[PDB]
Amino acid sequence: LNRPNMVSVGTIVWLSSELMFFAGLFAMYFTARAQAGGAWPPEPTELNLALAVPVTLVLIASSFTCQMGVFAAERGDVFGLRRWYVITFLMGLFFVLGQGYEYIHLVEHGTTIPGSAYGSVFYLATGFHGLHVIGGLVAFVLLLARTKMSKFTPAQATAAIVVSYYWHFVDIVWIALFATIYFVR
Amino acid sequence: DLPYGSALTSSGRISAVTEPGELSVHYPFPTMDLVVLDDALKYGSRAAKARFAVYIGPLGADTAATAREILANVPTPENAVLLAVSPDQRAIEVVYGADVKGRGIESAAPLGVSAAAASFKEGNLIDGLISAVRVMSAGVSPA
Amino acid sequence: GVDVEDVPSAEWGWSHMPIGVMHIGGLLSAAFLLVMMRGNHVGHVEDWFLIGFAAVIVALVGRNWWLRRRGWIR
Amino acid sequence: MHIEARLFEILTAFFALAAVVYAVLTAMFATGGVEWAGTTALVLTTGLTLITGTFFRFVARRLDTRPEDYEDAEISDGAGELGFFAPHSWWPILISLSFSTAAVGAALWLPWLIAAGVAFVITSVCGLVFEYYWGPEKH
Amino acid sequence: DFAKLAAAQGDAIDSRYHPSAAVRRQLNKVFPTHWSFLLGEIALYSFIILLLTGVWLTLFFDPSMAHVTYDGVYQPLRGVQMSRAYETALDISFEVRGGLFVRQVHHWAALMFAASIMVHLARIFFTGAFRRPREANWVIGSLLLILAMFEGYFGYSLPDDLLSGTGIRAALSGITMGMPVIGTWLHWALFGGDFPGEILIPRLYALHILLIPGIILALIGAHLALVWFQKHTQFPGPGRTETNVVGVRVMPVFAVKSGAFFAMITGVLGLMGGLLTINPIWNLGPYKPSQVSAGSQPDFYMMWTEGLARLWPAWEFYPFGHTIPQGVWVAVGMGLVFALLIAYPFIEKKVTGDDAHHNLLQRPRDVPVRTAIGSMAIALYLLLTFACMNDIIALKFHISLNATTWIGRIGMVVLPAIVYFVAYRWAISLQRSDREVLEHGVETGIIKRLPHGAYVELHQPLGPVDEHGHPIPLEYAGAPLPKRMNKLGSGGAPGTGSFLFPDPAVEHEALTEAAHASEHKSLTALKEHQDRIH
């Protein structure tokens, strides 16, 4: 093993680009917060941290299970990789459903995109993160089927590794979003 | 010897160069009649199912034997019809291989030489070669 | 009739269409475009579009016929 | 790959200096304080270059020298099988057409067209990712 | 019990009717297993659905043009003058349990019928299945397409609503009226008078539940009898010749496959009839001749007709005190299409001079001229269909409606030619791809560098290889060639256990060896048969 895996370097480079996309989203969020006039989040929204903490913990532990799946895949254990990646998929889907519940709770009160600037930036940033999470889940399903189609070669493990890279990037961006939206406010 | 800027690479292939603005190919004929001759050779060889070849160069003594010598370089000499013209010695020789035997070429070759020389007498080398290839390809028939 | 150097599997199916049919069809289509100019419409941008498409079709037909005439297409 | 990680480290350093200097220079002397727009972009540009360079440095520390990175080496050092490269595929054009369908749906805001475009995108990405792994049809 | 009973029933059946020879001949009939040979099956199965639901619809529909006041449950139409047919259609939708579901399943099955007939016709045309001795079967199929089109037309016209009434007025009345000498006579024979007659809905009902379905059933029976007794075609392949049929016997593989496809097609139709709204006639309202809506369109299989009416540029003739309207063109247009559809095998026989008996299909790539012709036809059909819909296209995808009409007018001449050129070149290019794979072998995708620095892609010869190494050029035999090494058994055996937990390695070894040996045995059997018949 005396070469770099270029699928991995390509995935790192693209993940950096996606981080820059989220930079654009953060630039949207931070402006219009300096225009809050001492109310941020301005009324009537009420940030329910009580439901937001569990989904963050679920996403972080799902990254832990994804890393466990990578450890399984690197030694040629296709079945352990499938187990840990099904765990990661279920837990990421749990995160998506928790974010949906948070969305419906906020909307029922009156925090919407056409309502306020806070709802605007909040829904934009978190919805694009949720889109990235749905993309990650699609990647997980596709990779699991691909491992089912063929003998588990090193290229299979490379693909699983780069999918885990994508999941780690998503969980980190979510940690930044959480620390900026629910703690710094 | 290798010319200026020519190198024998590690694969045995030769890597040549050209001075900026110069030509890798400098045949003393226009591109249009060269295209005409290329089309004539290609389509006549497809129509006669036999490769055709045109040679311009010195023949020395016994132009027949020289044309025998040079048809060995054709990729498929047995299935080949080579028209060798020495314009300074004013010699024409059609040479045809074993596979092209009794395929209508027996009459075509003298008629090919007649067409070549008839067009030559005006002073058009490529026109005569084109005419000879055309008439020979008409004469020869696919196996 | 066509050979297998231009259409590899010419022995397996109908693989040649006479050039005259496509030439005549192109000219007829250009004529149809020209005919569609006379009508019950008041606009004239569509007239320019019809003239342009008829012009390009006639140019293609004439180019093909000319090149086949000189043997540039065999 | 010491030089690659070195390039990205240099870029990361310059971008960190630019971001911090911009934040300090607009916290004071700017009308609204921290600009909150250029600062975020510069900070995450530092993040981009940092991610790439740090990953490349982890790669290079555990990597023995390749022929490419070693001066005065022979071509025969590079002999052997390179990896796998797709000879051909018609899936990229279908992926692009599906993304275009979804983009047209989102431009004109036709939700059905967006849904159809996303379905086509998923199908064509499935085709691309599965292309060289479909085994023989088992009958 | 059910063994001695089966033996006794077989003995009784054979003593009364002695069908053993004929029944065994039917059980041993071999059918090729290509997926496209299932397309026709779809057109059959949806038809069966159209019968079943159709019969159900006859138990509640009243085909009358007599005026009534609604007086029903659907509030937005109470007190509205309508026809008895529209009233009973609303009653099917709202008053009968499962009536709306049966209506929607029936209309979805009509759409599937039309679409599957079109796809099956495409398969037959492009694969050359119409050639001798299968020309009369093409003629029957074309008549079936025409009959199905007019059957669906007369069907969605049965509930006398505003949209279908507009369709009846525009097409069945205006075009019929405008024809020369016998046009108005045809109109008055058909409608029994002027257009808003009293014997139109009953007449269409009798044409639609009995007459056209009876003709269609007779033609389908003749069609399938011909396919059964002129055995099915097949693609060229390993053991495939002009004199054999290679595939599976009727019992049990083919029967199970056909029954399961029937079940799954019925399931698709049921899901669509449940989860997708088709023809919600309470929103359209009853048909009044004085009112019309913007989106006046027929079902998709008829749209080209209306499209041909939209784009033709208002050319009329007035010879000696008479009028030949624009709609005449439309009728002629339809006829031309229909004629050119029915006579195509004879036209191609007259053009190519090929009157040989054929049983091996052609790949569409190997017949570039016919493939280009069919592409031209499909492109023209699609352009007419979308021209019919240019109003909705211009409302959604913002375009001038005049711009869409002019795009259609220029396109219905330019686009067929472009499509012909592109399709012809594309078919020849596919042939060249096959030739490259035969000359050099499957490109694996692996690239390696030689000690002198030459990059070479590893090639996989598909046959004999010369002394040092290079493929011995094979000969094209009219069959597909592998072009991905994954399709050959390269890297194709993961762990044999469940999706999450594996099985013991001994069972994996046994199953892998069994698969390997069975595949080798099948390949060997095919090769020995092919050598024996050669």
Ligand SMILES: CC(C)=CCC/C(C)=C/CC/C(C)=C\CC/C(C)=C/CC/C(C)=C/CC/C(C)=C/CC/C(C)=C/CC/C(C)=C\CC/C(C)=C/CC1=C(C)C(=O)c2ccccc2C1=O
């Ligand atoms: C193959 C062929 C046409 C042979 C005929 C031979 C010939 C030259 C006849 C003369 C042609 C003439 C004179 C006129 C042409 C007009 C004509 C033939 C009318 C009769 C109707 C007819 C037989 C049409 C051809 C059959 C046809 C187009 C079948 C469809 C092609 C196939 C195989 C499609 C399979 C792909 C599939 C199942 C789904 C892909 C999804 C898409 C985008 C399908 C395209 C599509 C279609 C096809 C619609 O019909 C449609 C209707 C309403 C709204 C939208 C759509 C739509 O998007």
Ligand code: HEM
């Ligand atoms: C190829 C065969 C058939 C086709 C393509 C066809 C097509 C259609 C269509 C599209 C409708 C409109 C449904 C709606 O809008 O509600 C319809 C209505 C109807 N069909 Fe059929 N049909 C076929 C066969 C039959 C048969 C065999 C029967 C009777 C046994 C039947 C009975 C009816 C009745 C009574 C209606 C009017 C009731 C209603 O519209 O709800 N159809 N037909």
Ligand SMILES: CCc1nc2ccc(Cl)cn2c1C(=O)NCc1ccc(C2CC3(C2)CN(S(=O)(=O)C(F)(F)F)C3)cc1
């Ligand atoms: C212009 C066609 C049309 N526009 C509209 C506008 C709105 C709507 Cl909602 C429907 N549409 C349609 C339509 O539904 N199109 C399908 C269609 C059905 C029947 C017919 C007629 C054509 C024949 C039956 C009539 N003839 S015939 O031979 O001369 C004679 F006299 F009947 F013998 C051919 C034509 C098209």
